C-alpha cells in the first residue's frame, strides 16, 4: 500500500517535497549506499511527521507505511531506507502506548486466552525520536571502532575486501597503538577505486598494507589470522548482502578455518527475508568489466556485472555492531527489540 | 588510429630481415633507403612477386641524443657534444 | 552554472512513418518507455536547468505529455518549454529562429532526435567552459564515443573520420564516411601548427554538441547552413567562418547514441536490455513500472501470467498484464503492457507495443507492431514488417519483408479488417 | 646470494627480472636471446607453448654447438646449456613444463654413448627432442582434448578460467564435432587473459558469457561443468595453476559442479606444496596500479607511487595450489584418472 | 609504557604476580590479604568457590568498614572496595564469576539512594550478597545438578575432566539416587587435579577409571557421556573452561559422544573471543619442569634452568575456548538450552 494512492502526484509534490525528491534520487541512484540513504530517509520522515495532519494514530501509521512503501519501491535493494521507516513506525507505536495508559511474555500462550487525541501533537515527541536516530547514525563509527582493542592485536594478519568506512575506522583506531598487518583485496570491478584509496590511508597510519587482486584471496588465506568485512545490509535470516566478490573471501576463509568478523551498524539490519537472491543481487553496467569499444566481443557474448554478493548467515562468526559484539544467532533478538514485525513488509 | 608527426626526423638507423637484400638487387628504381622504406606496402593489391607471414615495419622514437648531420647540423651536433669538464 | 539545452524533436520523424502517424517519434516506446524520457534523463544528468523542445508533427500530443510528465513537477531538475514551428525543420532553421528570440543565454547542448545516454556531461562542460575562458573563438565541442570501426552501434551517420590534436583535443578535420570516397584529404598547413595529430576511424559520432551563445548568431549569418555536421563543421574547417575552432570530447566510458533509424532503434534498444546504459535500465522503474531483472536478460513486470509449457527465452521484455499461450516461444523480444499471445506461437527479434493481440500458431519475428494491433490465427509475419496504429489482420494471412502498414491516408500500403493484404481492407 | 627472509610472507619470492639484453654474457645463443625476450615480455604464452619453444630453441643451440678441445661433447654441452638456462631463468622463472623438459634433455646428454662422433651425438639428441615434443606434448594434448570433450553432454554450461590452450582446444573441438553447449569465461585482474579466450571462442561461434572472478558466486548457479588447464599436477594430487583457480574449484564444489583438470603427464611433478606461498611467481605490482579495465592505456592511478609510500605494498601472485579434494578428475593422455594417481603415472615414465 | 606486544604470541598475557605481602598497601583488610594468599597459592579451588569466598570476605570488609564523616556511605564505600580489588587482582587475575559478582556489588553500592543509617545500609548489603550467594550460586547449582542427573541413564560411562565442583556434585548425587554408572576421570599436567577428583569420587563408592589426557582417544571408545564444568560461558555459545577441555569436547564429538556443559547463569559473560590466546591466564612455567608422576616432590628436570636458556621457553595456559559447535547442550538453572542462547539469558538477568 503505497502513496500513489491516498494522494495525488501534485499533492505529494506540494505537501511532501522531500519525499518527491528522495524518490527521484533513489531511482536515479543519486542518494546511494546504506549511510546516505539512512540519513536522507530519516530527514524526509521528519518532514512527513511535521507536515502530515491526523487525528488518529492509525492514520499516522498507515500514512508513514504508505510513504515507506513508495520510498522502498523507488530503490528496493537499499534496505537502509525501509529500516529507518520501520524504526520510526515502532517509535510511533509505543510512544502511543505509554501515552495510552498515562491516561490511566510468550507468543506461545496467545493461542489460549482473551480475545479483544491518541494521534496528534505527539508530533513534537516523534520529531525528537527521529533526531535521536540521526544522532545514533553519527555515533556508529565511534561506537564500533573502540571495540578494535579486543580483536585486533599486534603482528596479526587481517584480510579485508573493498571499502568500508566502518572497517577502516575499526582498523586505524587499533593501529594508533598496536602494530599489525592488513591485506586488502580490491573490490574489482565495483569497489576498486575506493579500496585503493582506503589502502593508502591505512598505510599512512602505518598498518603495513598489502593490495592484492581478487584471485589472490585464496593463496594468501593460509597466513591470515582474521577476516574483517563490511556489509551493505544484513537480511532477515541473518544473511549478508554485501559488495561484489565478498563470498570469495567468505568461502576461502571457511576452507582455511579463518574466523569471519563483520563490522556494521544495526541500521543495516533488515527484516526482509531473502526468499530470493536474484531479486537481491543488482547488476551494474557491463562497462565496468568490459570496454564498450570491444565491438566484436560485446555483440557476441553475455556480459554480466553484479553489484552485490550474498553471504549465507552461517559463514559469519562475529558481528561487531554499535551495540557491541554478538553471534549471528542473536540477530533474532536484535530485531524483535528494534522493529515491530508487522512492518517487515512495508 | 594513426598518430601523425612532422616533429620526427630519420636517424638513419635501420635493421632489416635478411630477405630485404633480396629486396635490394632485383627491384630497383629503389632509392636511398628512405626511398626504399616507403614501398614496403602492406596493403591493397601491391602486386610485385613477393616470396614468403604478413610483412610489417615498426618505428621507434627516442627522447634524447640521437640524430644525424647531413645538413649543417654539424655546427649544432658538434656544439651538442660538449658533455665534458676538464 | 545556469545551463540550457535544445532538443530537436520531430527531426527524424519521417523515417518511422507508418508509425509517427498516431503518436510522434519522441513518444515511441523503446523498451516500454517513450524515447523522450531517455533524452530528459540524460539532460537532467548533465545538469541542464532549461529545456527547449522544437517539434511539429503531433506537437499537441507532445506538449500534452510534457505537460503531464515527470518534468513539469516542482521537483523537476529543469524547466521544459516547447517550440512549435513549421514541420521538417533543419538544425540551422531552428538555430536561426533560436537567435531571433535571444533565448540562448550561455553555453548550451544541441541534440537532434532522441538521445539514449548515461554520460555525465558535467566534466565535458567544465572542459568546454575553461577552454572558452582562455579563448572565446572556440564555439563548439562535440561529444563522441570511442569504439571500433565496424562497431554495431556505429552506423552510417556515426561513421566519420576525425583528426584531433592529441594535446589540445581540437578537431582539425572531419569527414563523413561515404562509399566512393576512398581518401582522407588534409590541407598541409594544419601540420605546421598542429603536430601530433590523431586520425581516428574508431569514433561514434553521437552528435551531442556543446555549443556557445555565439552559434545561433553564427547561423543567422551564413544562412546557407542546414546540417550541424555537413555544413557548419565543414564551414568552420574550410573557413567559411574565419576564426572559429571546434573540439572533440572522446568519451571512454558509458554510453551514448541517438535513435534516428529503424535499425538504430533496434540497436540501442537491446543495448538497453544489456545493462550498457545503467541506471537507465527497465528494472530501475523510473516511470513507476514494476520490472524485475532475471538471468539471460529477461525483464518482467508484475501481473504477467505465463502459461506452463511456455518458453520465454533470453533478451525478452514483457510488459504488465501480458498473457502468453500454451507451447509458445518468445525469444529476444520487446512486449508492452496488456498484450495477449495466442498458444503455440514463435516470436523472435520482434517488437510488440501496448494492447497487441496475437492469435494461435503465429510466426512473428523482426517486426514492429504498434499499439492496439490485433493479429488473427495462423498468420505469419516476417522481418522488416511494421504494423502501425491498430491495423487488424485476420486468420490465415502471411506478411513480410519490410512492408509498412497503416490505417491512414498516406503512402504506405494497407488497411484494417479481416484478411488484409490481400483481401484488402482498403484495396490500396 | 639472497638469504634474508624477513617478516613479509612474500619476501622469499624472487622478484628480480631481466627485460633487456644490456650487459648480456657473450656465450648466449641468438635463439636463446629471442626466447628470453619473448618470455619476459609476452603476456599470453602457454606453459605448453613455452616448453615447445624451449626445446626447439635448444635444438638450434645443440646443432650449432661445437665441442671445444678441453672436453668431450657429453660433459661440456651440459655446461653450455646450463649457461643458456641461467640466462633464461634471469628473464623469467622456469615453468614446471620447462623444468621437466630440461631434466629430460640433460639426462639424454649424460646417457649419450661416447663412441658416437659429435655429429652422431647431436643428431641423436635432436631426434629425442623431436620425439619429446611429438609424444609428450602434441599427441598427449590431442588425447586429452578428445578424452575431455567426451564428457561434454548436450545442454552443458562449461566454465573456464583465463586463457587455457588445453581447455580452449577442448571447447572448440566440442563445437566442431557437434556438441550443443555454452561457455562461461571467468576473467580476472591485473590482466584480462579471459578476453583473449573470449575472443577466440566467439570467433569460433561458441556461445559465451563473460564475468569477473568476483561474480563467481552469481554465475556459478548456471554452470554444469568446470574445465581447468593446469600448469602442473602435484604428487599429492593438488592442482598447480594460475591465480584464482582454487577459488573456481572451491565455489564449484559448493554448487556440486564437477571440477575437471586437464594436464599433460609431462607436466606432472614430484613436488608437493602445502600452501600457495612456498612455490609461486611474483608479478610486478605496477600492474595493479592502473585499474580502469585496461593494461597499458594510461590515466594516473591512486597507487602510482606505492614504492615510495611507506607500509603500502602491491603484489599479484601468478599461481596458487588447489587442494586435491577439490579436483574431481585429472584428464591426461593416460585417460581420466583420480589426481592422486599422479605419482603412480610418474613411475610409468 | 607498561606494554609489551612482540613476536611472541604469548607476550601480551599478564605474567605479573604478587606471591608475598611484602610492601603490601596499608589500607588492605586482613580478610582480603588471606584471600590474596590463598588465591595465589592454592591448587584446590576454582571459580565457584572463588566467588563465594570473595563475597563473604567483602561482607567482612563492609562490616568492619567505618564511615568517615567528611562524606558518607555511598560515595566512598565503592572506593575502599576498589582498593581491596586492586590488591586481589595483583595476586591473581579475576575470574569471570568474581568479576560479575563485582559488578553486582558495585551496582548495589550505588543504587541505595542516600537513605538509611549506615548500619541499616550495611544490613541490606550483606542480604543480596547473602541472596546472591543463595540464589545465583548454591540454589542454581542444586538445580543444575538435578537437571543434569536425570540425563544420566543406567549403564552410562561418564567422562569428567579434572576437578569440577558442579560435575562432581552431579555424579555423587547420581549414585545417591541409585543410578548405575561408572566415571572416567581425565587428568593433565602440570598439577593433577583429576587425582583430587578420583580421590573424592572413589570415597563416595563410585566406579572409576583414571587416564591422562594423552590417552583420550583410547578411553573415549568406552565413554557414552561427557560432563563439563565451566569457568565461564561465552556469548557466542562457546565454553571457556580449563586448558584441555576443548580437546575433550573435540574427540568426544568424533566419537558421537554428547558434550554437556554445566554452568551457573551468573558465570555467563558478554565477552566473545575467537581463540584461546587473546584472553587467558598464565601459569608458572616452572610447574612444567617437574618430571611427571608427581608434583612438588622436588625432582630436578632437564628444563630446570630454562629461564637462563635462550630460545627455550616453558608455557602452560590455564584456560581454553571450546567452540559452540562442539557443545551439545548447556545445563544451567534455566534448564537445558542450546549454548548459543547464552546472550538471551543475560537479558532476562
C177 contacts: CB under 8 Å, gap ≥ 6: C156, C159, C160, C161, C201
Residues C270 and C379 in one domain: no
Residues D291 and D203 in one domain: yes
Residues E20 and E92 in one domain: yes
- Residue D253 to residues A77, C295, D210, D323, Cα–Cα distance (Å): 29, 22, 21, 12
Chain A interface disruption, residue of D184, D214, D309, most A CBs within 10 A: D214
Residues E121 and E224 in one domain: no
The alpha carbon of residue D72 is apart from the nearest alpha carbon of chain A, in Å, by 47
Q: Please report which residue ranges of chain A form alpha helices under DSSP H.
A: 9-15, 17-27, 34-51, 57-74, 80-100, 123-138, 140-145, 165-175, 192-204, 217-221, 246-255, 295-299, 331-336
Collapse the DSSP code of B34 into the 3-class scheme (helix H, G, I; strand E, B; otherwise coil) and give the result: coil
Helix (H) or strand (E) holding C366: none
State how far the Cα of D67 lies from the Cα of D55, in Å rounded to an integer.
20
Contact A299, A171 (CB under 8 A): no
Collapse the DSSP code of C54 into the 3-class scheme (helix H, G, I; strand E, B; otherwise coil) and give the result: strand
Q: Is the peptide bond preceding residue E296 cis, with omega within 30 degrees of 0?
A: no
By the CB < 8 Å criterion, does D291 face chain A? Answer: yes
Per-residue b or e along E114-139, where b marks 16 or more CB atoms closer than 10 Å to that residue's CB: eeeebeebbeebbeebeebbeebbee
Experimental determination technique: X-ray
Residues C107 and C204 in one domain: yes
C-alpha cell of D222?
A: 548456471
Q: Nearest by CB to E274, which of A155, A318, A324?
A: A318
D314 contacts: CB under 8 Å, gap ≥ 6: A210, A211, D285, D286, D288, D289, D303, D306
| Rounded (10°) angle between helices A57-74 and A34-51 | 150
Residues E237 and E339 in one domain: yes
Residues E134 and E222 in one domain: no
By the CB < 8 Å criterion, does B2 face chain C? Answer: yes
Residues D127 and D155 in one domain: no
Residues of C within 8 A of A293 (CB-CB) are 146-148, 151, 202, 252
- Cβ within 8 Å, pair E235-A318: no
Residues E99 and E170 in one domain: no
CA atoms within 13 A on the CB side of C272: 30
Residues C176 and C245 in one domain: yes
- Strands of D335-337's sheet, edge to edge? A301-303, D208-212, D182-187, D157-161, D225-229, D259-262, D329-332, D335-337
The alpha carbon of residue D194 is apart from the nearest alpha carbon of chain A, in Å, by 11
Where does residue D307 fall: left (phi above 0), alpha (psi -120 to 50 degrees), or beta otherwise? alpha
Residues E269 and E309 in one domain: yes
Looking at E92, E114, E143, which one is the last position of a domain? E143
Residues C191 and C307 in one domain: no
C-alpha cell of C88?
A: 521538417
User: By a Cβ cutoff of 8 Å, what residues of chain C touch chain B?
Assistant: 163, 166, 191-192, 195-202
Residues C353 and C224 in one domain: no
- Domains of chain C: total: 2
Looking at D76, D109, D143, which one is the last position of a domain? D143
Residues E120 and E237 in one domain: no
By the CB < 8 Å criterion, does A285 face chain C? Answer: yes
* Neighbors of chain D with 3 or more C-beta pairs under 8 Å: A
Residues of C within 8 A of B61 (CB-CB) are none
Residues C106 and C215 in one domain: yes
C324 contacts: CB under 8 Å, gap ≥ 6: C306, C307, C310, C312, C318, C330, C341
Chains C and A touch (3+ CB pairs under 8 A): yes
Residues E126 and E5 in one domain: yes
Q: Nearest by CB to A329, which of E237, E274, E275?
A: E237
- Cβ within 8 Å, pair C286-A27: yes
- Strands of C305-306's sheet, edge to edge? C305-306, C323-324, C340-341, C357-358, C374-375, C392-393
C-alpha cell of D257?
A: 559442479
Residues of C within 8 A of B4 (CB-CB) are 163, 191, 195-199
Which structural domain range is residue D244 located in?
144-349
Looking at E85, E113, E143, which one is the last position of a domain? E143
Residues of A within 8 A of C147 (CB-CB) are 292-293, 295
Q: Find the length of chain E.
A: 349
Q: Name the resolution in angstroms.
A: 3.0
The alpha carbon of residue D274 is apart from the nearest alpha carbon of chain A, in Å, by 10
DSSP E13-42: S------S-TT--TT--HHHHHHHHHHHH-
CA-based nearest residue in chain B for residue C198: B3
Contact C412, C406 (CB under 8 A): yes
Q: Nearest by CB to C278, which of A21, A285, A295?
A: A285
CB pairs A-D closer than 8 Å: 188
Looking at C240, C258, C291, which one is the last position of a domain? C291
Q: Taking the CA atoms of C25, C31, C37 and C38 in sequence, report the sign of the dihedral they define.
A: negative
Residues C175 and C298 in one domain: no
C334 contacts: CB under 8 Å, gap ≥ 6: C31, C32, C269, C316, C317, C350, C351, C352
Contact C353, C20 (CB under 8 A): no
State how far the Cα of D129 lies from the Cα of D112, in Å rounded to an integer.
14
Residues C286 and C297 in one domain: no
- Cβ within 8 Å, pair A259-E274: yes
- Residue D266 to residues A6, D44, D138, D261, Cα–Cα distance (Å): 75, 21, 11, 14
Looking at C291, C309, C332, which one is the last position of a domain? C291
- Strands of C404-405's sheet, edge to edge? C292-294, C298-300, C317-318, C334-335, C351-352, C367-369, C385-387, C404-405
Question: Which residues pair with residue A184 across a beta bridge?
Answer: A160, A211
Looking at C269, C291, C313, which one is the last position of a domain? C291
Residues C175 and C207 in one domain: yes
Residues of E within 8 A of A327 (CB-CB) are 235-237, 272, 324, 340, 343
Question: Which residues pair with residue E228 across a beta bridge?
Answer: E261
Per-residue b or e along B52-62, where b marks 16 or more CB atoms closer than 10 Å to that residue's CB: eeeeeeeeeee
Chains E and B touch (3+ CB pairs under 8 A): no
Residues C278 and C359 in one domain: no
- Cβ within 8 Å, pair D218-A304: yes
Q: Taking the CA atoms of E238, E244, E247 and E252 in sequence, report the sign of the dihedral they define.
A: negative
- Cβ within 8 Å, pair E270-A329: no
Of A283, A261, A273, nearest in space to A234 by CA = A273
CB atoms within 10 A of CB A323: 14
Residues C38 and C91 in one domain: yes
Chains C and B touch (3+ CB pairs under 8 A): yes
User: By a Cβ cutoff of 8 Å, what residues of chain A touch chain E?
Assistant: 150-151, 153-155, 178-179, 226, 259, 261, 317-318, 324-327, 329-330, 333
Residues E177 and E133 in one domain: no
Collapse the DSSP code of C98 into the 3-class scheme (helix H, G, I; strand E, B; otherwise coil) and give the result: helix
Residues of C within 8 A of A303 (CB-CB) are 274
DSSP C122-170: HHHHHHHHHHHHH-TTEEEEEEEEE--TT-TT--TTT-EEEEEETTT-E
Helix (H) or strand (E) holding C172: strand C170-176
Helix (H) or strand (E) holding E122: helix E118-131
C142 contacts: CB under 8 Å, gap ≥ 6: C171, C205, C206, C207, C208, C209, C210, C246, C247, C248, C249
Residues of C within 8 A of B8 (CB-CB) are none
Q: Nearest by CB to C195, which of B1, B2, B5?
A: B5
- Cβ within 8 Å, pair A289-D212: yes
State how far the Cα of A121 lies from the Cα of A52, in Å rounded to an integer.
11
Where does residue C264 fall: left (phi above 0), alpha (psi -120 to 50 degrees), or beta otherwise? alpha
Q: Taking the CA atoms of A334, A336, A341 and A346 in sequence, report the sign of the dihedral they define.
A: negative
Which structural domain range is residue C206 located in?
1-291
Could you identify the residue written with the cell 552431579?
E170
Residues C277 and C425 in one domain: no
By the CB < 8 Å criterion, does D309 face chain A? Answer: yes
Of D163, D251, D258, D174, nearest in space to D210 by CA = D163
Residues E102 and E220 in one domain: no
E287 contacts: CB under 8 Å, gap ≥ 6: E190, E191, E295, E316
CB atoms within 10 A of CB B47: 6
Collapse the DSSP code of A186 into the 3-class scheme (helix H, G, I; strand E, B; otherwise coil) and give the result: coil
- Cβ within 8 Å, pair D217-A247: yes
- Domains of chain E: total: 2
Amino acid at each position: 500500500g503505497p502513496i500513489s494512492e491516498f494522494m495525488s502526484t501534485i499533492n505529494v509534490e506540494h505537501t511532501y517535497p522531500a519525499v518527491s525528491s528522495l524518490i527521484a534520487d533513489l531511482k536515479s541512484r543519486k542518494v546511494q549506499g546504506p549511510f546516505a540513504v539512512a540519513v536522507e530517509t530519516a530527514l524526509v520522515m521528519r518532514q512527513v511527521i511535521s507536515q502530515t495532519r491526523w487525528s488518529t494514530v492509525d492514520q499516522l501509521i498507515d500514512t508513514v507505511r504508505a510513504v515507506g512503501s513508495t520510498l522502498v519501491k523507488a530503490q528496493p535493494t537499499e534496505f537502509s531506507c525501509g529500516n529507518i521507516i520501520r524504526r520510526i513506525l515502532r517509535l510511533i507505536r509505543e510512544e502511543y502506548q505509554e501515552l495510552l495508559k498515562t491516561a490511566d511474555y510468550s507468543s506461545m500462550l496467545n493461542l489460549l486466552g482473551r480475545p479483544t487525541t491518541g494521534g496528534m501533537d505527539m508530533r513534537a515527541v516523534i520529531i525528537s525520536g527521529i533526531q535521536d536516530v540521526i544522532d545514533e547514525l553519527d555515533k556508529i563509527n565511534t561506537d564500533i571502532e573502540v571495540q578494535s582493542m579486543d580483536h585486533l592485536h599486534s603482528n596479526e594478519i587481517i584480510l579485508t575486501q573493498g571499502c568500508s568506512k566502518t572497517v577502516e575506522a575499526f582498523l586505524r583506531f587499533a593501529a594508533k597503538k598496536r602494530k599489525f598487518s592488513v591485506i586488502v583485496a580490491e573490490g574489482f570491478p565495483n569497489n576498486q577505486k575506493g579500496s585503493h584509496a582506503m589502502a593508502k590511508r591505512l598505510a599512512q597510519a602505518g598498518i603495513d598494507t598489502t593490495v592484492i587482486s581478487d584471485a589472490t584471496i585464496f593463496a594468501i588465506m593460509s597466513r591470515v589470522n582474521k577476516v574483517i568485512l563490511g556489509t551493505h545490509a544484513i537480511l532477515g535470516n541473518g544473511g549478508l548482502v554485501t559488495y561484489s566478490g565478498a563470498q570469495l573471501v567468505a568461502q576461502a576463509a571457511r576452507h582455511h578455518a579463518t574466523p569471519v568478523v563483520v563490522c556494521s551498524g544495526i541500521y543495516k539490519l533488515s527484516p526482509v527475508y531473502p526468499y530470493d537472491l536474484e531479486s537481491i543481487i543488482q547488476l551494474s553496467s557491463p562497462d565496468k568489466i568490459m570496454s564498450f569499444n570491444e565491438g566484436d566481443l560485446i555483440s557476441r557474448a553475455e556480459i554480466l556485472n553484479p553489484y552485490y554478493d550474498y553471504i549465507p548467515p552461517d559463514l559469519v562468526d562475529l558481528f561487531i555492531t554499535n551495540l557491541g559484539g554478538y553471534p549471528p544467532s542473536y540477530l533474532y533478538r536484535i530485531m524483535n527489540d528494534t522493529y515491530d514485525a508487522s512492518d517487515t513488509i512495508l | 588510429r594513426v598518430t601523425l608527426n612532422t616533429n620526427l626526423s630519420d636517424a638513419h638507423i635501420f635493421v632489416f630481415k635478411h630477405w630485404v637484400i633480396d629486396l635490394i638487387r632485383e627491384k630497383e628504381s629503389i632509392s636511398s633507403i628512405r626511398g626504399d622504406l616507403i614501398p614496403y606496402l602492406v596493403k591493397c593489391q601491391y602486386q610485385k612477386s613477393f616470396t614468403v607471414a604478413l610483412i610489417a615495419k615498426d618505428g621507434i622514437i627516442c627522447s634524447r641524443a640521437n640524430n644525424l648531420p647531413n645538413y649543417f647540423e654539424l655546427n649544432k651536433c658538434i656544439a651538442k657534444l660538449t658533455p665534458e669538464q676538464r | 552554472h545556469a545551463l540550457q539545452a535544445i532538443v530537436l524533436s520531430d527531426s527524424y520523424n519521417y523515417r518511422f512513418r507508418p508509425l509517427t502517424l498516431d503518436k510522434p517519434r519522441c513518444l515511441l516506446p523503446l523498451a516500454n518507455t517513450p524515447l523522450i524520457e531517455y533524452t530528459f534523463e540524460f539532460l537532467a544528468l548533465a545538469g541542464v536547468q532549461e529545456v527547449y523542445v522544437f517539434c511539429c508533427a503531433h506537437a499537441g500530443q507532445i506538449r500534452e505529455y510534457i505537460e503531464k510528465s515527470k518534468w513539469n513537477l516542482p521537483s523537476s531538475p529543469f524547466s521544459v518549454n516547447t517550440i512549435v514551428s513549421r514541420e521538417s525543420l533543419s538544425v540551422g532553421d531552428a538555430l536561426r529562429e533560436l537567435d531571433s528570440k535571444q533565448l540562448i543565454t550561455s553555453d548550451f547542448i544541441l541534440v537532434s532526435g532522441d538521445v539514449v545516454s548515461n554520460v555525465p556531461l558535467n566534466e565535458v562542460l567544465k572542459e568546454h567552459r575553461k577552454r572558452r575562458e582562455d579563448d572565446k573563438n572556440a564555439i563548439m565541442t562535440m561529444v563522441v564515443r570511442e569504439a571500433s570501426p565496424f562497431h554495431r552501434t556505429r552506423a552510417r551517420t556515426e561513421s566519420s573520420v576525425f583528426v584531433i590534436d592529441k594535446k589540445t583535443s581540437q578537431c582539425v578535420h572531419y569527414q563523413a564516411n561515404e562509399r566512393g570516397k576512398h581518401y582522407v584529404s588534409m590541407d598541409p598547413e594544419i601540420f605546421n601548427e598542429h603536430e601530433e595529430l590523431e586520425v581516428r576511424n574508431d569514433l561514434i559520432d553521437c552528435q551531442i554538441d556543446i555549443c556557445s551563445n555565439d552559434v545561433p548568431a553564427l547561423f543567422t549569418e551564413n544562412f546557407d547552413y542546414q546540417d550541424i555536421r555537413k555544413d557548419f563543421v565543414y564551414g568552420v574547417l574550410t573557413s567559411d567562418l574565419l576564426g572559429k575552432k571546434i573540439h572533440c570530447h572522446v568519451a571512454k566510458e558509458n554510453y551514448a547514441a541517438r535513435v534516428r533509424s529503424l535499425q538504430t532503434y533496434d540497436a540501442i534498444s537491446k543495448d538497453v536490455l544489456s545493462r550498457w546504459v545503467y541506471p537507465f535500465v527497465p528494472d530501475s522503474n523510473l516511470l513507476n513500472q514494476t520490472f524485475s531483472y532475471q538471468r539471460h536478460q529477461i525483464y518482467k513486470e508484475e501481473d504477467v501470467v505465463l502459461a506452463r509449457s511456455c518458453i520465454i527465452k533470453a533478451r525478452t521484455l514483457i510488459g504488465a498484464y501480458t498473457k502468453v499461450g500454451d507451447a509458445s516461444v518468445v525469444a529476444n523480444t520487446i512486449i508492452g503492457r496488456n498484450c495477449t499471445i495466442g498458444s503455440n506461437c514463435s516470436i523472435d527479434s520482434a517488437f510488440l507495443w501496448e494492447d497487441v493481440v496475437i492469435g494461435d500458431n503465429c510466426r512473428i519475428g523482426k517486426a514492429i507492431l504498434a499499439n492496439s494491433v490485433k493479429i488473427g490465427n495462423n498468420c505469419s509475419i516476417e522481418d522488416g514488417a511494421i504494423v502501425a496504429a491498430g491495423v487488424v489482420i485476420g486468420d490465415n494471412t502471411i506478411i513480410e519483408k519490410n512492408k509498412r502498414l497503416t490505417t491512414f491516408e498516406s503512402h504506405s500500403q494497407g488497411t484494417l479488417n479481416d484478411p488484409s493484404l490481400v483481401g484488402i481492407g482498403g484495396r490500396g | 646470494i639472497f638469504e634474508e627472509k624477513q617478516v613479509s610472507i612474500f619476501s622469499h619470492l624472487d622478484w628480480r627480472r631481466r627485460r633487456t639484453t644490456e650487459n648480456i654474457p657473450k656465450d648466449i645463443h641468438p635463439a636463446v636471446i629471442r626466447l628470453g625476450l619473448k618470455l619476459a615480455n609476452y603476456k599470453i604464452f602457454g606453459s605448453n607453448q613455452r616448453c615447445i619453444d624451449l626445446l626447439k630453441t635448444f635444438k638450434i643451440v645443440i646443432q650449432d654447438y661445437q665441442t671445444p678441445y678441453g672436453t668431450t661433447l657429453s660433459r661440456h654441452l651440459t655446461t653450455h646449456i646450463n649457461s643458456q638456462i641461467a640466462y633464461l631463468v634471469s628473464t623469467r622463472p622456469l615453468s614446471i613444463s620447462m623444468g621437466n623438459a630440461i631434466r629430460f634433455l640433460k639426462l639424454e646428454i649424460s646417457v649419450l654413448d661416447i663412441d658416437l662422433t659429435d655429429d652422431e651425438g647431436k643428431e641423436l639428441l635432436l631426434e629425442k627432442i623431436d620425439s619429446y615434443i611429438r609424444d609428450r606434448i602434441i599427441i598427449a594434448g590431442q588425447v586429452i582434448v578428445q578424452a575431455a570433450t567426451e564428457k561434454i553432454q548436450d545442454g552443458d554450461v562449461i566454465l573456464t578460467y583465463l586463457h587455457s590452450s588445453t581447455v580452449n582446444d577442448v571447447l572448440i573441438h566440442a563445437k566442431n564435432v557437434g556438441k550443443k553447449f555454452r561457455v562461461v569465461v571467468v576473467d580476472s585482474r591485473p590482466e584480462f587473459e579471459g578476453r583473449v579466450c573470449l575472443k577466440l571462442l566467439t570467433e569460433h561461434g561458441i556461445e559465451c558469457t563473460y564475468v569477473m572472478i568476483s561474480a563467481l558466486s552469481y554465475i556459478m548457479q548456471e554452470v554444469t561443468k568446470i574445465f581447468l588447464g593446469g600448469h602442473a599436477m602435484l604428487s599429492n594430487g593438488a592442482l598447480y595453476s594460475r591465480a584464482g583457480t582454487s577459488l573456481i574449484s572451491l565455489l564449484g564444489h559448493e554448487s556440486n559442479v564437477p571440477v575437471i583438470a586437464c594436464c599433460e603427464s609431462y607436466k606432472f611433478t614430484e613436488r608437493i606444496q602445502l600452501d600457495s606461498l612456498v612455490y609461486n611467481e611474483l608479478a610486478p605490482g605496477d600492474q595493479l596500479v592502473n585499474m580502469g579495465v585496461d593494461d597499458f592505456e594510461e590515466k594516473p592511478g591512486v597507487l602510482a607511487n606505492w614504492k615510495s609510500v611507506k607500509n603500502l605494498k602491491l603484489l599479484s601472485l601468478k599461481y596458487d595450489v588447489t587442494p586435491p579434494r577439490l579436483i574431481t578428475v585429472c584428464v591426461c593422455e593416460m585417460g581420466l584418472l583420480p589426481s592422486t594417481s599422479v605419482p603412480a603415472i610418474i613411475n610409468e615414465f
